[PDB]
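Input:
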Amino acid sequence: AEAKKGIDVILLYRVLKNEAKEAAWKMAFQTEHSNGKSRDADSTATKDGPIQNMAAIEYDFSATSIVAVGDKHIDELDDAFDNSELVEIWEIDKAEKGTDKDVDKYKATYFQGYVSSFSKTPNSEDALELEIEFAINGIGQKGYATLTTDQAEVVSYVFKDTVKVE
Amino acid sequence: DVAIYFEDEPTTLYYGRYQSAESVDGSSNSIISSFTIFCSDPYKYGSQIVS
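Output:
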């Protein structure tokens, strides 16, 4: 079988109030992100053995990227953090494709939440780095999502001849 | 009242009776707890001497 690479999972964002004007955009130069879920297990001891009682779900979310020059979406995220508005998040997997009624769609998951951290540490010898954390309401939903052509490929050059370009 | 003897004092005598216990847990078969004895005559007697 074949292992699954971690470079095939990307993230998309969109501010909630602009859901009728634009499609979700992709943040550039992503390095890693972490997604975790957990439940609190409460144990009660009886004469037969421990019995576990489970609690609600807690989400732990984080992201990391490199700030690019001329990118205006970081300003949108900063304004959303300042004014405390809702943000949508998509987690799209590029290694899975749909079969019957979703031919050009990938498996994904849908979240909404706020922004609760915004940090950056510029040093004298490295590149600028950005770290974001979220607080998520409710329970994430499952389905299939659409990726445009320019957000799913990498650009490279092709063969060229040895004559002057006209 | 009854007589109470302790092994680390082999030459003493006590007077008292059981008063109350402490709550025990019902989730185990090895239990540690305690109970209280109430002595109203507070003195510790010795052997009897006839002279």
